[PDB]
Design a protein around this nucleic acid. Structure first.
Lengths: 87, 48, 312, 360, 25, 95, 307
RNA sequence: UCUGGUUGAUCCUGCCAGUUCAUAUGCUUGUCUCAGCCAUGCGUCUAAGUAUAAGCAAUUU
RNA sequence: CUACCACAUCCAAGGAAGGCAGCAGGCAAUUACCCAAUCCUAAUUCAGGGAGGUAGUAUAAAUAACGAUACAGGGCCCAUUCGGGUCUUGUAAUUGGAAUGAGUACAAUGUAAAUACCUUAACGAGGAACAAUUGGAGGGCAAGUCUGGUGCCAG
């Protein structure tokens, strides 16, 4: 009957989860891991998020370049110059 | 005072790995500050 | 007095809630007789039925609907005490519960677990009934045991909760007066509105019938799926008249309502029957139990069973 | 299985009502006999808009485009941006979105870009002063359509930002068995990239028709210019009849095309509103589909809305028919006891719908 | 079939701080 | 008097405002907006703790008592059960 | 003008209820039936199809049969976010990916919940066990339900495995319905020092190759002593080695750690309890706990001497 | 009602802070001792006035 | 008991009958045992009495008392400040024999009978687990988490 057919399917899924619960955990799920424990270069395959200690060095893209030169032009248009003078 | 006894349970310390037993006892911040402060005393006196 | 009046008015306030109980012809209140095996669930129900309908049901199986008042009816269900799944689903539908506690032995797992399940799916009205108290040999230990049990029942259920005490069983019947005392309490019980119950439709199977043609059972075999009709009284929100409504049966699965039809009342309440400060007339009291043996006749499947010169 | 329906008729309604129900739907035979069969770009774009604000939905367009299988997800929302194709304006996409916004996990903060007006679609002001007020009546306290930039046809270039801060479990029960009294008539006459006289002349046409009334007439003279005036010149007028007693509104809208006289259009939209009022009892025809749905998704209580005989047309019938298959809800109508008019009271019950997608 | 209540369920002491034994008397 | 002559007050829990706050056991975590059943005036109350915030949920009855400035009230029972009793797992909240 | 707010809300509820009854009196009995349906108290006939063969055969009248209507959310299946705790009277804490017989609404089923913590609300981090005496966020796959619905959990329902212990294992309330979760596990890489120059140090065994180091250049690292450092560059020779600059000089016995996080997924397992369909009706058995499984195969609990 | 501040140190007047057999509510013990509405339930018999009981018992009563 | 005014019950609708239009409760167990004791009504010694009686449901104790041994030098008090003052101590160590209460209860007594009271055989303690609470003040711990910084810091 249909109901026992589903029971056979459930029993199959049980035995698979049965084996996985006792099977050795993957290096990703073992917490502490060493290069020897996991496959070499496995971290290339997996996407891992990590913090960076210091500010990244900026990239001078064009949009930065236009923004900087705009401010230079506005300073000279107003002659707002921070330069030393005789005292 | 609203802290339970369980919330204040001890968190125990780990030790050196057996493979690394030859490199010496595994140190902690409490041990590190002892060397850091004493090194600073050396440098300050050496500086003067 | 103003400070007192403020505090009493404080207790009167509650969260506003809508009770979906119909204003006319409400369903009987579901009484779940829950207790560990052997505490006396069956003898209680037989005692509880007799005080109402004047007739002993020698054998009880399934829900038992009985008249209790001029406009009140009750449906008695014993909880299968050895099944946990049976405690779960009854807890979600029992409007009233009679909790059987062996006074000599004390509380058991199967008791408080239902209380926690009942505590966790909506606490219904909870009534404790204490039994096997005649087993006590000393009055001093009986009173002390009663005090300990009633106080502990006050921890699970609101302090001052009503707890009944039953001494022994005679002729499969409890003492009349204690059996009579509980009558007045159950009659006057009002039931709080529960969120789960007042939002969904549910109904308890009074009887069970298989409508599959016998020929289909043979030409395909018993394995074939079966057309079934299940009867009973509706509770909670109204059930939509159009077929196809999705409904779950505990321990079975999800099915769709193939057909729906209303039938007249098998157990018409007194105020309803006569319609078609004065005491309930004993004619009006009625008992309707399809699966159970009422009188002397018991029906199972399609075979019916009864108890009972010219002879030549 | 899937509730199976025919043609592009009421396409969005059948997606949104599917979304509100959670019941998956199939719509087949979309313009099968046409030279260009299957879904058109705008209604493909609409399905993308549904996917953006719903989460877990499955949408399957057929090989020829003539069949869609829609399995709704939960309404989640969030901040997003939608590109409206030039075929339809933003108004085509904002109105069906108003059906879903109050019932989401997160607030709807969506930027719509493209043309903003047409002869057949709702304008900003129609949504703004014409359909949004009905939501204030239904319990959506905070909801706004911010107009950043207009785009007149054919080139468009407009931007409108929809915000519905009010998230409510279900719409409040409706009780309007009286024909609301209109206190005043307001409206907005708008133009882009063209001289302000066009707006004034538009208002001139409007006051001419309506000055016979005993009302205050105040139509806003509002003129776009500069960077934010769109990429095409255009103009339209929206006149609203407003009832301050119970916060009810009736509105008529249309835009002026090439060669048209602004006075002529102002006269149109003015007599247009008056025609709408004569055909209205509590809500206009352009608001009736909005009003009925929220009642069908209210709490399990009977709510009363008064409707005129002129409102119950083919549009009211198919719309009612669509609701029944999705919800199984039937709208009953009973005559009013009055003899002055022959209006009808449409009694509906909410299905007990609740906003389960919200964090509690 | 009959299963009795354990100590934790018979007292419901809950979670309490440890108290010195001189406090008993 | 804060309650107009009463020592305690009922209310209905509307929202836990600081539920999104980052710092654990914060004062902002600690506040819950409650609407008094007497008069419909919405107010805010203190709980015993982030653990005891966890028993309270929206739309449950709560008993209030006098106590971030601006908050003067303390919740002492929920649905007729003491929060301290629940916190000591000495009782179970009834639903 | 009512004295208290409470009776105002009661007045509105009563007014609607009074309104409701007036029109059903106005509707005809059949027209009422078409609109309201079958009200409570009605004795009704429900006919069902495709009912499984075992129900009618394995029918015990002593066991009740209960029917409950399902709302649209009840039909939908997905991930259920639940706040859960080990029952105070349950002896033992629950485990992640451990079967739990769970009762939502009218239905009972067995699932594999994932018990999680907000980490003070930066991220949903997987937890290995339930907290001893407090709630925790729980994620499991199954039929959806409206939020604020209380539930209860059990590990054993069969009489054979009942024993003497309390079987109510978990208690909780649902807070959200969606059809995934983004649970993550914290994965740290551990490397070892071999050459030290004051703050600067060379580390080994962190990475198998400079392929890995290049990705993690500049990443935050710390030692067990708490001294913070960075990955400055991968050393060409030998393969996998990199240079690190630390907040203070580290010692040879120190162990350097890089903190990172790996995503975790919820298992889509469903096994409704169908006790009534069984002859016993009291020996329903599903997925077994990890402890019993090891006992059946005679396996010791895994352990690490270093841990 | 008292106590400490406001002065380089005192007196006086001010300000600040701490200072119930009354009512509700919470935990424990109470193992001993002790103290207008509700259809809510519901006569008489001694030796001593009359025996033909087709009552009983006894047998010489 | 008669008529009248209202209430209300059963019915074969032809009639009959009631004073409950009561009592007791809530905003929920008033029950069970007796005429013995003080008294009484009667064709009376003996019969009976819901007269009457019997039973049912803030005040003093216990959670401990007495020794022996082993191992260690710190223990306490004052003082804003620096410091000063004082001596048999600590055990988060081992160990011995005694006492008895709550309980488990054989009896008699008590009484209309019975409960209770009083008296009284046997058993009854080391985690004496035969496991009273309530409130407050301080800590400290992680390859743990977060936030802001003038590194190893601060919250």
């Amino acid at each position: 009957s249909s109901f026992e057919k589903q029971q056979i399917e459930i029993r199959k899924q049980i035995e698979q989860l049965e084996n996985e619960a006792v099977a050795e955990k993957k290096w990703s799920l073992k917490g502490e891991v060493k290069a020897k424990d996991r496959p070499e270069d496995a971290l290339l395959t997996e996407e891992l998020e990590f913090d960076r200690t210091a500010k990244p060095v900026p990239v001078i893209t064009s949009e930065v370049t236009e923004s900087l030169e705009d401010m230079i032009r506005r300073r000279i248009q107003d002659s707002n110059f921070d330069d030393l003078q005789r005292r | 005072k609203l802290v339970h006894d369980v919330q204040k349970k001890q968190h125990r310390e780990r030790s050196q790995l057996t493979s690394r037993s030859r490199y010496g006892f595994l140190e902690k911040h409490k041990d590190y500050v002892k060397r850091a402060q004493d090194f600073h005393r050396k440098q300050s006196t050496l500086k003067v | 007095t103003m400070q007192r009046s403020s505090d009493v008015n404080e207790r009167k306030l509650h969260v506003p809630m809508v009770d979906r109980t119909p204003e006319d012809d409400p369903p009987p209140f579901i009484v779940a007789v829950v207790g560990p095996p052997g505490t006396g669930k069956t003898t209680l129900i037989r005692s509880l039925v007799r005080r109402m309908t004047k007739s002993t049901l020698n054998d009880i199986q399934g829900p038992i609907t009985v008249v209790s008042g001029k406009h009140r009816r009750l449906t008695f269900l014993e909880c299968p005490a050895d099944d946990l799944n049976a405690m779960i689903d009854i807890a979600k539908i029992a409007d009233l519960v009679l909790l059987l506690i062996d006074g000599n032995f004390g509380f058991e797992m199967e008791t408080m677990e239902f209380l926690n399940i009942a505590q966790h799916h909506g606490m219904p009205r909870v009534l404790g009934v204490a039994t096997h108290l005649d087993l006590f040999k000393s009055q001093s230990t009986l009173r002390a045991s009663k005090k300990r049990l009633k106080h502990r029942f006050w921890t699970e259920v609101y302090q001052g909760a009503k707890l009944f005490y039953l001494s022994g069983v005679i002729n499969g019947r409890y003492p009349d007066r204690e059996i009579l005392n509980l009558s007045r309490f159950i009659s006057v019980m009002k039931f709080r509105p529960l969120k789960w119950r007042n939002e969904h439709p549910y109904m308890l199977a009074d009887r069970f019938t298989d409508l599959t043609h016998p020929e289909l059972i043979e030409t395909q075999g018993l394995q074939i799926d079966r057309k079934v009709a299940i009867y009973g009284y509706l509770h909670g929100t109204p059930l939509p008249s159009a077929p196809g409504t999705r409904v779950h049966i505990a321990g079975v699965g999800d099915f769709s309502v193939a057909q729906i039809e209303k039938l007249p009342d098998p157990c018409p309440t007194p105020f309803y029957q006569q319609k078609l400060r004065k005491r309930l007339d004993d004619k009006d009291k009625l008992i309707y139990a399809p699966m159970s043996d009422v009188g002397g006749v018991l029906m199972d499947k399609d075979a019916v069973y009864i108890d009972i010169e010219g002879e030549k | 299985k899937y509730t199976t329906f025919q043609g592009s008729q009421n396409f969005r309604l059948r997606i949104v009502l599917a979304t509100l129900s959670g019941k998956p739907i199939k719509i087949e035979k979309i313009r099968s006999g046409d030279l260009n069969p299957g879904l058109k770009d705008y209604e493909v774009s609409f399905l993308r808009l549904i996917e953006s604000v719903t989460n877990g939905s499955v949408i399957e367009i057929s090989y020829t485009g003539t069949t869609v299988i829609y399995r709704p997800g939960i309404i989640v929302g969030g901040a997003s941006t939608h590109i409206c194709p030039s075929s339809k304006p933003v108004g085509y996409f904002v109105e069906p979105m108003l059906y879903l916004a109050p019932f989401s996990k997160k607030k709807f903060s969506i930027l719509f870009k493209g043309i903003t007006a047409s002869h057949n679609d709702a304008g900003i002001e129609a949504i703004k002063w014409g359909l949004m007020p009905v939501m204030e009546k239904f319990g959506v306290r905070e909801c706004a359509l911010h107009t950043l930039k207009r785009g007149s046809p054919p080139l468009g270039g407009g931007e409108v930002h929809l915000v519905v801060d009010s998230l409510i479990a279900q719409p409040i029960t409706m009780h309007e068995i009286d024909r609301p009294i209109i206190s005043s008539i307001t409206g907005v006459a708008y133009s882009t990239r063209v001289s302000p006289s066009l707006v004034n002349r538009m208002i001139d046409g409007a006051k001419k028709v309506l000055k016979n009334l005993q009302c205050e007439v105040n139509i806003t003279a509002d003129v776009w210019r500069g960077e934010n005036s769109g990429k095409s010149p255009g103009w339209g007028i929206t006149l609203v009849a407003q009832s301050k007693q119970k916060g009810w509104s009736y509105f008529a809208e249309d835009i002026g095309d090439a060669g048209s006289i602004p006075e002529e259009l102002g006269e149109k939209v003015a007599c247009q509103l008056l025609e709408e009022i004569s055909k209205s009892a509590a809500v206009g025809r352009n608001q009736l589909p909005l009003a009925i749905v929220y009642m069908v998704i209210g709490k399990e209580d009977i709510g009363r809305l008064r409707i005129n005989k002129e409102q119950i047309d083919e549009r009211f019938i198919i719309l009612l028919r669509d609701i029944k298959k999705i919800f199984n809800t039937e709208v009953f109508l009973k005559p009013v006891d009055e003899a002055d008019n022959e209006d009808m009271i449409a009694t509906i019950k909410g299905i007990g719908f609740t906003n389960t997608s919200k964090k509690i | 079939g009959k299963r009795a209540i354990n100590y934790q369920i018979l007292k419901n002491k809950g979670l309490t701080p440890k108290r010195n034994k001189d406090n008993r008397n | 008097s804060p309650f107009g002559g009463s020592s305690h007050a009922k209310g209905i829990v509307l929202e836990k405002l600081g539920i999104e706050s980052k710092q654990p056991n914060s004062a902002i975590r600690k506040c819950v907006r409650v609407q008094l059943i007497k008069n419909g005036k919405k107010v805010t109350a203190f709980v015993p703790n982030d653990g005891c915030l966890n028993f309270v949920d929206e739309n449950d009855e709560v008993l209030l008592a006098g106590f971030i400035p601006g908050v003067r009230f303390k919740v002492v029972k929920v649905s007729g059960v003491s929060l301290l009793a629940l916190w000591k797992e000495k009782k179970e909240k009834p639903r | 003008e009512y004295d208290t707010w409470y009776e105002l809300q009661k007045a509105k509820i009563s007014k609607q209820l009074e309104i409701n009854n007036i029109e059903y009196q106005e509707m005809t009995p059949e027209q009422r039936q078409r609109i309201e349906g079958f009200k409570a108290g009605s004795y009704v006939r429900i006919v069902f199809e495709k009912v499984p063969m075992e129900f009618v055969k394995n029918f015990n009248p002593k066991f009740p049969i209960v029917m409950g209507g399902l709302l649209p959310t009840e039909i939908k299946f997905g991930i259920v976010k639940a706040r859960l705790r080990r029952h105070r009277w349950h002896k033992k804490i629950l485990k992640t990916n451990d079967p739990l017989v769970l009762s939502l609404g009218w239905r009972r089923f067995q699932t594999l919940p994932i018990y999680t913590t907000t980490d003070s609300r930066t991220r949903t981090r997987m937890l290995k066990y339930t907290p001893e005496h407090t709630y925790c966020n729980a994620a499991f796959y199954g039929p959806l339900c409206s939020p604020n619905t209380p539930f209860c959990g059990v590990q054993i329902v069969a009489n054979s495995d009942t024993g003497n212990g309390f079987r109510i294992a978990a208690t909780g309330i649902v807070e959200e319905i969606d059809v995934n979760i983004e649970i993550v596990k914290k994965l740290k890489l551990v490397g070892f020092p071999y050459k030290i120059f004051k703050n600067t140090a060379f580390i080994k065994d962190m990475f198998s190759s400079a392929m890995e180091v290049a990705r993690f250049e500049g990443a935050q690292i710390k030692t067990v002593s708490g001294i913070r450092g960075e990955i400055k560059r991968a050393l060409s020779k030998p393969e996998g080695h990199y240079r690190a600059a630390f907040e203070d000089k580290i010692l040879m016995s120190d162990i350097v750690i890089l903190r990172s996080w790996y995503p975790v997924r919820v298992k889509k397992f469903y096994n409704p309890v169908t006790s009534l369909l069984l002859k016993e009706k009291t020996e329903w058995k599903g997925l077994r706990l990890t402890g019993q499984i090891r006992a059946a195969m005679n396996l010791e609990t895994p352990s690490n001497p270093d841990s």
